[PDB]
Write an enzyme that holds these catalytic residues in place. Structure first.
Site, PDB file in Angstrom:
ATOM      1  N   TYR A  71      34.885  43.100  17.346  1.00 46.27           N
ATOM      2  CA  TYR A  71      36.079  43.488  18.085  1.00 46.27           C
ATOM      3  C   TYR A  71      35.974  44.921  18.590  1.00 46.27           C
ATOM      4  O   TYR A  71      36.309  45.207  19.745  1.00 46.27           O
ATOM      5  CB  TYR A  71      37.308  43.311  17.192  1.00 46.27           C
ATOM      6  CG  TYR A  71      38.608  43.364  17.944  1.00 46.27           C
ATOM      7  CD1 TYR A  71      39.109  42.232  18.566  1.00 46.27           C
ATOM      8  CD2 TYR A  71      39.337  44.541  18.031  1.00 46.27           C
ATOM      9  CE1 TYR A  71      40.297  42.268  19.260  1.00 46.27           C
ATOM     10  CE2 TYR A  71      40.530  44.586  18.723  1.00 46.27           C
ATOM     11  CZ  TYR A  71      40.999  43.444  19.345  1.00 46.27           C
ATOM     12  OH  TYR A  71      42.189  43.468  20.040  1.00 46.27           O
ATOM     13  N   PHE A 131      39.807  43.334  49.448  1.00 40.76           N
ATOM     14  CA  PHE A 131      39.703  41.913  49.143  1.00 40.76           C
ATOM     15  C   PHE A 131      41.071  41.365  48.731  1.00 40.76           C
ATOM     16  O   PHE A 131      41.993  42.119  48.407  1.00 40.76           O
ATOM     17  CB  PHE A 131      38.667  41.661  48.041  1.00 40.76           C
ATOM     18  CG  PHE A 131      38.548  40.208  47.648  1.00 40.76           C
ATOM     19  CD1 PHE A 131      38.227  39.242  48.598  1.00 40.76           C
ATOM     20  CD2 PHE A 131      38.792  39.803  46.342  1.00 40.76           C
ATOM     21  CE1 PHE A 131      38.143  37.900  48.250  1.00 40.76           C
ATOM     22  CE2 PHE A 131      38.702  38.462  45.985  1.00 40.76           C
ATOM     23  CZ  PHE A 131      38.377  37.511  46.943  1.00 40.76           C
ATOM     24  N   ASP A 222      34.587  49.291  45.381  1.00 37.70           N
ATOM     25  CA  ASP A 222      34.727  47.900  44.966  1.00 37.70           C
ATOM     26  C   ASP A 222      33.357  47.244  45.100  1.00 37.70           C
ATOM     27  O   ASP A 222      32.840  47.084  46.211  1.00 37.70           O
ATOM     28  CB  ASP A 222      35.796  47.186  45.793  1.00 37.70           C
ATOM     29  CG  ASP A 222      35.928  45.689  45.443  1.00 37.70           C
ATOM     30  OD1 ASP A 222      34.926  45.024  45.080  1.00 37.70           O
ATOM     31  OD2 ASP A 222      37.043  45.160  45.560  1.00 37.70           O
ATOM     32  N   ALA A 224      31.659  44.277  43.804  1.00 39.61           N
ATOM     33  CA  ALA A 224      31.231  42.905  43.500  1.00 39.61           C
ATOM     34  C   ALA A 224      29.862  42.589  44.102  1.00 39.61           C
ATOM     35  O   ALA A 224      28.995  42.020  43.429  1.00 39.61           O
ATOM     36  CB  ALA A 224      32.274  41.902  43.997  1.00 39.61           C
ATOM     37  N   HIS A 457      47.076  27.179  50.299  1.00 39.06           N
ATOM     38  CA  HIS A 457      45.758  26.572  50.467  1.00 39.06           C
ATOM     39  C   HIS A 457      45.209  25.995  49.168  1.00 39.06           C
ATOM     40  O   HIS A 457      44.354  25.102  49.211  1.00 39.06           O
ATOM     41  CB  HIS A 457      44.773  27.593  51.051  1.00 39.06           C
ATOM     42  CG  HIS A 457      44.582  28.809  50.199  1.00 39.06           C
ATOM     43  ND1 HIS A 457      45.543  29.791  50.075  1.00 39.06           N
ATOM     44  CD2 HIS A 457      43.538  29.205  49.432  1.00 39.06           C
ATOM     45  CE1 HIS A 457      45.102  30.736  49.263  1.00 39.06           C
ATOM     46  NE2 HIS A 457      43.887  30.405  48.860  1.00 39.06           N
TER      47      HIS A 457
HETATM   48  C1  LIG Z   1      45.999  44.632  15.029  1.00 38.51           C
HETATM   49  C2  LIG Z   1      45.646  44.346  16.516  1.00 38.51           C
HETATM   50  S1  LIG Z   1      44.110  43.334  16.616  1.00 38.51           S
HETATM   51  C3  LIG Z   1      44.615  42.147  17.931  1.00 38.51           C
HETATM   52  C4  LIG Z   1      43.963  40.758  17.656  1.00 38.51           C
HETATM   53  C5  LIG Z   1      44.864  39.870  16.783  1.00 38.51           C
HETATM   54  N1  LIG Z   1      45.940  39.311  17.131  1.00 38.51           N
HETATM   55  C6  LIG Z   1      46.266  38.829  18.409  1.00 38.51           C
HETATM   56  C7  LIG Z   1      47.354  38.060  18.632  1.00 38.51           C
HETATM   57  C8  LIG Z   1      47.815  37.796  20.002  1.00 38.51           C
HETATM   58  C9  LIG Z   1      47.016  38.411  21.148  1.00 38.51           C
HETATM   59  O1  LIG Z   1      45.891  37.609  21.432  1.00 38.51           O
HETATM   60  P1  LIG Z   1      44.512  38.002  22.008  1.00 38.51           P
HETATM   61  O2  LIG Z   1      44.925  38.700  23.319  1.00 38.51           O
HETATM   62  O3  LIG Z   1      43.589  36.957  22.246  1.00 38.51           O
HETATM   63  O4  LIG Z   1      44.075  39.083  20.975  1.00 38.51           O
HETATM   64  C10 LIG Z   1      48.889  37.052  20.252  1.00 38.51           C
HETATM   65  N2  LIG Z   1      49.631  36.491  19.241  1.00 38.51           N
HETATM   66  C11 LIG Z   1      49.271  36.682  17.912  1.00 38.51           C
HETATM   67  C12 LIG Z   1      50.147  36.020  16.849  1.00 38.51           C
HETATM   68  C13 LIG Z   1      48.200  37.420  17.592  1.00 38.51           C
HETATM   69  O5  LIG Z   1      47.845  37.611  16.284  1.00 38.51           O
HETATM   70  C14 LIG Z   1      44.760  40.123  15.272  1.00 38.51           C
HETATM   71  O6  LIG Z   1      43.813  40.595  14.691  1.00 38.51           O
HETATM   72  O7  LIG Z   1      45.885  39.752  14.584  1.00 38.51           O
HETATM   73  C1  LIG Z   2      40.304  31.615  49.182  1.00 36.95           C
HETATM   74  C2  LIG Z   2      38.927  31.810  48.616  1.00 36.95           C
HETATM   75  S1  LIG Z   2      39.053  31.766  46.846  1.00 36.95           S
HETATM   76  C3  LIG Z   2      37.527  32.497  46.319  1.00 36.95           C
HETATM   77  C4  LIG Z   2      37.854  33.727  45.501  1.00 36.95           C
HETATM   78  C5  LIG Z   2      36.609  34.509  45.021  1.00 36.95           C
HETATM   79  N1  LIG Z   2      36.878  35.427  43.933  1.00 36.95           N
HETATM   80  C6  LIG Z   2      36.024  35.261  46.216  1.00 36.95           C
HETATM   81  O1  LIG Z   2      35.512  36.481  45.912  1.00 36.95           O
HETATM   82  O2  LIG Z   2      35.955  34.933  47.407  1.00 36.95           O
END
Ligand SMILES: CCSCC/C(=N\C=C1\C(COP(=O)(O)O)=CNC(C)=C1O)C(=O)O
Ligand SMILES: CCSCC[C@H](N)C(=O)O
Ligand SMILES: CCSCC[C@H](/N=C/c1c(COP(=O)(O)O)cnc(C)c1O)C(=O)O
Ligand SMILES: CCSCC[C@H](N)C(=O)O
Ligand code: NA
Ligand code: NA
Ligand code: NA
Ligand code: NA
Lengths: 466, 466, 466, 466
Positions: A71, A131, A222, A224, A457
């Site tokens: 992490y 973009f 940018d 890409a 689209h």
């Molecule tokens: C101390 C901070 S560490 C952060 C990782 C972690 N928990 C993440 C959670 C998330 C977020 O989700 P993600 O964005 O994928 O991290 C949403 N809901 C709940 C119930 C969680 O526990 C942990 O270690 O408890």
């Molecule tokens: C409407 C085209 S969608 C394609 C998105 C893509 N990230 C690109 O760079 O073109």
């Protein structure tokens, strides 16, 4: 047209098939005559995008297998930091899950930073061309996105070396008109995606950056398709004739203060993005605070360790000149097959896609009945190939009038993934399209069976006309 | 203490090492006495988080290898949609890159939905306990987060079956105070991570949903650890004694209208998130329009095809009762090792971590000098084990005084990744912490060398006092 | 009994299940009461062998992915040649597909060499103990296999430092009796697998080689478990208390002229073998000529490039002392569990297996009725653990009288794969066998339902008596 | 020449490079002007063999990852047994580490089986053409290998549908001359590798089988390229032009009693072999007893479980007509590029390789100066392509005279791996050879610097004459 041989060989394949004509008709009717709604199982060669559909190398997969999923403080995070210093001479990185995530990290922070100095009261961004997601993030944060690409880019069939250039006259006019205090950032998009993957010259990047620095305006590259841009610089600028690709890249990034990157393009990945900041630690600190609630912890940014590992390796592979020559030469080969058969295209071809002018193929179909979509649908029915519309259908309606926005061009985009398709696949695309030439006049326009309010689209359902 | 054998065997290993004491000294000083700043190369056993550090199965890796990277219509998108219908009986999905991406997709849409009738003038979210990122998005969107957990959870050492339950009286009193029209949504966190990964009972989930439907309040299930909650329901609820784990899960999701999920927890992944909506097509449509700028196109949502494929498989493996019995039993085993040695913990142990009360270990260190962080730092120096603080260092300062906000508990969280460490690693952790009993009295507090104005626990550079 | 923690953590798992009691009964009946006929689907913990069932590291899997599959001149062949020079100081290598393939390459060449000036009219091989395949190849080439292990090996429960040593007296006596012109080669098996994985001392290896050298006798080191032998030399020989494992290995191979190796053991592979020759270029040349028709071309020898790649990495990982200490400690742990519970075993435990004397567990079952197989079958029925018999059932019938050849002892071998099972798996095995102490008396012998004339232990079908 | 598009796309690449001309000269010098001694790092496109260099699919890699490494009763063993029953209708299998392993298992058993029948006093094998390893095993077991290919095979440039056919008159003649009681087996090689990968017709296979059955003679199908043969039967036999490839294969194996297969060819593997026996259980049992000491236990046969898993998948993929049409069509395309430029080749091209008649290219170079090797070496020096010699160098010296065996044809074999190289790679090969047309007359022969007594083409060092 000249075929350029692969500077690699195949190590792993993925089966694709052409559905029978009856299956293709059934699938397209089922998808509401909108290939975006087709399941991939109904598609032979997929040309919707070059984003995230690339083929990785065995070294990238090996790097994934030993990826550090920690992490905090993943070994691959530090490798990526070192790689960004080595490629760009930039001292700070924030990984992101993809390019629009990198924009969501950096752009609001750039606005906040300039606002805290008492500036950016009427904030705007200036780009050669923002973009789609870049402009959307600019607008989500209450800023105007100004696009000032060179007028060379609008003459579709007339060759120019640098159709992605900034118009320097417009740059200066816009700085004078809005005030340097209100320019949050200048965004240099390389290659210029909205100009069709056309390169920005080194002298243009340099002059843009010099102007910005004189005004104290922050510049974001940018990035890409930055390797494709570097290849075009080496190919077309005599000053870089004998330079390596990494030398070109190093110079390009002298002319930005930071970069945002979809690593799903030139770094040869299926997922991944990157923010890198040259040396402004204050902006880096602000950006890290926004990274946490939006993407993840600062040493993975919504990326598994294996994907940071693949990015370190893909950043290297994407700079290899032999690969770039072949990749861009394959796009040029497809364009040349079409051009030599009388099919009108954007010329020269850019780094990653061929753009076919469908207005000229199907003159009988008005813009508001989506001629490029008609051509795309015919192509799919004829061959199982799935392309994407860059015309009236994509442009949407004018929110003020509710009527169709007039499209300058009705393009079918043939977007080419990296290291996926052979030149025989290119011939298959070209031959299927050339083979519609007696059918073009009979083709019919399209109407809405169902239309969303925004982003139509992607999910709209269509029906042929008469 | 009881060691439960693995219902699997090891197929691939990753080397780990104990840095020397002087390496640990230099690394923690380099990291400014904040283990979050440590590189993983300085860490032996990593207990920072159970999020994204899990070991996948061979079947999960196989699913990645055949993953469909198509931009639109990926085969694994439909598998994932099918999987959510199977497990949750929900009809709509939107993949996200991880849990906070799912929240960023759905929560703004829930606010817009309640607001578009004149409601939500003073909008709030009510949860049993918002996790950090969940409450940060709630407050990022101009709303307040309300944690109405049962007070059973605040009696650290006293056993209770459902320390993650909503407080039903506080739910009804909050609905009266704020009004049903201001409650954007009720969020049911399963398990309740902030309560110590403590389960929510089926009868509590049912009563919250029924109360919510009385007032027309949308209910979201925060589902990062839903399988561990289902296990505890089977383990402790007589009605589900003979139910399969999937049957428990199916019943749980009768009591929500949608779910957000970090798939980096119970679905056994290194990256991935998910929004699923039971049947409200309108909220699904609005959620798809926000997913595009923030995450990606709606059929991969910031996720490679290979990660959607891994998620489909991991969702299945995460429900397996033999696996859950072993996983939760490992956490319980570590807790028992410490509890039998007089180390005070939250009891019973939750699904994914052990919470050690450090107020009782270092009484000579007050809250504002971070007692739990002094214990964590001592543990790291003693052993190379990296844990994480749930106390005065995390809580931060108050927005009014600029002074230390008072913390109820000073917890050290020993967070356990799934299928990564053996019970001999647990014994290493327990024995290192038990061996600090002779050194607890000697420890000192921590002051700031550097303190960032926000998110200080991620990057502050602390310093030992005296 | 002391549990030793893994110097690694788990990166990939493989699900294994315990069949229900009725399932195990039905499977064993379909298998004709011979576990060698069980499908793996019917086995929980598999203790049949430590050959080819090891868990590889992420580095090994990464090396496979970039493996060079070239028919001639593979990069990994040169890496393997370099590795053999580095580890053994041997100048010539021939990859083989596994250990008995290496023997098939080298042993006929050694016999033809001894029968090329003068005569080896009564040709014999002399080993501390020939493994099953080793002795089989000796007897397939018209030679006698002479096993002269130290008599300490036959005192099953009494400790000794080097139960794998050559009997130096019996060596000098065999050389005098047969003549040095009849001894095709001396085989130093390290560890001595047939003694129970017991080590050979450095002093013993050296004296054997000196004796061989003064008679011009060629010495082959059977090297399947050469790292485990090196570990034991470092642990028990004071001369090597502060030597590295590689320094111990380097000294070992001063006392041979060539090696044959199953890389499916200590080099941590699932497939793979190796011949290496120290400096005899003539033997190398003729061995290469047998390699071509029997195994494959000489730069891959029946092995994919990826497996030479995995072997280069596994040769390194197998020498790591932290790993060897944990591996041999886990075996010692299983043996100490049983020994402290009264179950008789060979003491001390070897490097890779525990051997249980079953004639003491089921005295009522005579040798000709396979008491060790009855213990194995009961163990399997109670726990789903599959062990292998080393006694009367394996020894077979005497081809002259056509009756049961008398076995000196009846062993059950609990063979432990590398990095696959936890010490909790060890407890599960030990507790299952201990739990049968009350049933050992009521256990019945076995008889033949179907008996092949040769290699009966593999495919014979047995029937419980009474 | 017609390019046929790939029925797949690229999922993983492997970098290759053209060494500089300076590097190719230095490398060929170091390899003693024997490309078999070049390291792969000196080779751009490798055309040495189609054996074991194939690219696998994502489904094959996924199967490897979940492969079951159990010593006995591997899941993939039973899948493989099932697959052989499906494809060939054969009831028994023995996996082998590769094709010559399969020959080593089966041929000695067939000889002992015929000898125990009181026969086989002057034993021989009869084949349309024994492959090199096949004939080696035949002769290693004291038998004579008799080759009776159709005389159509020797009219090299003249088309014929079935250049691999047995000469039926010679078959009947040899059976009478030697006696059926001396014919250990008839070996039907499909395609006929030594005739150039040329197919054997169904009616020829059938008539050979019916003749064999009239005399009690056992028939083995040597099956390395059985799918390519099935494709040619579908392509050229009007009876089968509406059959599926699997229907053709199913009919082919009505005309054998067993098969030996290198799975490194048509089943698209990098390692692996197979014995399958139609219904003779006695021969199956005897072959199992030889398998144990030579290859491994009978349920893995010297293969990792992952390779049995890959074999199950590759056996299916190797039958797919779209793939076969592309694969064989690509070999045809290379041949047509050469033929259209006046380069003499064996015509029609076989399934897997193009054979270039170098006698016509360098008439000034006598046979015992290796004209094909001079062309091969020049091709390498100009291009980095490594081909292999099928002429006087390979043919070797006559045992009776010590002189150069006279060669009927001096062939350079361009052997094409499956799914590895594109048609642009084919163009690269052809263009390099066509660019040599002005240099052929200046090329000089070669002479030995070092010559081994046997198998000289693998290891001999050569030198340009003057
Ligand atoms: C101390 C901070 S560490 C952060 C990782 C972690 N928990 C993440 C959670 C998330 C977020 O989700 P993600 O964005 O994928 O991290 C949403 N809901 C709940 C119930 C969680 O526990 C942990 O270690 O408890
Ligand atoms: C409407 C085209 S969608 C394609 C998105 C893509 N990230 C690109 O760079 O073109
Ligand atoms: C189920 C019992 S048989 C599994 C074979 C295994 N031992 C193999 C071995 C070999 C053969 O090497 P290989 O052909 O690769 O198996 C050669 N020399 C020695 C000292 C060996 O111990 C073992 O005892 O568990
Ligand atoms: C002329 C060398 S033949 C070497 C045999 C190998 N199986 C192959 O296919 O090339
Ligand atoms: Na993707
Ligand atoms: Na991770
Ligand atoms: Na190979
Ligand atoms: Na194996």
């Amino acid at each position: 047209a000249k075929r350029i041989v692969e500077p690699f060989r195949i190590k792993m394949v993925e089966k694709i098939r052409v559905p029978s004509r009856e299956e293709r008709e059934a699938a397209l009717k089922e998808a509401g005559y909108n290939p975006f709604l087709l399941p991939s199982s109904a598609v032979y060669i997929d040309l919707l995008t070059d984003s995230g559909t690339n083929a990785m190398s065995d070294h990238q997969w090996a790097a994934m297998i030993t990826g550090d999923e920690a992490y905090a403080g993943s070994r691959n995070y530090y490798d990526l930091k070192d790689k960004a210093k080595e490629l760009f001479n930039y001292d700070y990185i924030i990984p992101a899950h993809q390019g629009r995530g990198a924009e969501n990290i950096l752009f609001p922070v750039l606005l906040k930073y300039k606002q805290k100095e008492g500036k950016a009261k009427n904030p705007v961004f200036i780009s050669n061309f923002h973009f789609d997601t870049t402009a959307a993030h600019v607008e989500l944060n209450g800023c105007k996105a100004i696009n000032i690409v060179t007028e060379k880019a609008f003459d579709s069939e007339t060759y120019d070396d640098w159709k992605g250039d900034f118009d320097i006259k417009k740059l200066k006019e816009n700085i004078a008109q809005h005030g340097a205090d209100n320019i949050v950032a200048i965004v240099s998009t390389v290659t210029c995606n909205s100009a069709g993957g056309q390169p920005v010259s080194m002298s243009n990047l340099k002059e843009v950056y010099e102007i910005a620095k004189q005004h104290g305006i922050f510049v974001v590259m940018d990035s890409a398709r930055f390797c494709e841009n570097a290849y075009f610089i080496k190919a077309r600028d005599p000053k870089y004739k004998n330079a390596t690709i990494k030398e070109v890249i190093f110079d390009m990034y002298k002319y930005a203060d930071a970069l945002t990157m979809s690593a799903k393009k030139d770094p040869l990945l299926n997922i991944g993005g990157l923010v890198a900041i040259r040396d402004n630690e204050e902006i880096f600190t602000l950006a890290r605070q926004r990274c946490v609630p939006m993407e993840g912890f600062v040493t993975y940014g919504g990326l598994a360790g294996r994907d940071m590992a693949a990015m370190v390796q893909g950043l290297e592979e994407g700079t290899e000149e032999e690969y770039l020559h072949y990749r861009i030469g394959q796009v040029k080969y497809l364009g040349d097959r079409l051009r030599e058969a009388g099919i009108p295209i954007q010329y020269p071809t850019g780094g990653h896609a061929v753009f076919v002018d469908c207005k000229k193929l199907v003159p009988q179909i008005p813009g508001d009945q989506f001629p490029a979509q008609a051509v795309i649908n015919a192509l799919y029915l004829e061959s199982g190939v799935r392309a994407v519309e860059i015309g009236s259908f994509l442009l949407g309606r004018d929110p003020a009038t509710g009527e169709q926005k007039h499209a300058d061009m009705e393009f079918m985009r043939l977007t080419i993934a990296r290291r996926v398709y052979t030149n025989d696949h290119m011939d298959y695309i070209a031959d299927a399209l050339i083979g519609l030439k007696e059918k073009f006049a009979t083709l019919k326009g399209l109407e809405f069976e169902y239309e969303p309010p925004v982003l139509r689209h992607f999910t709209a359902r269509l029906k042929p006309i008469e």
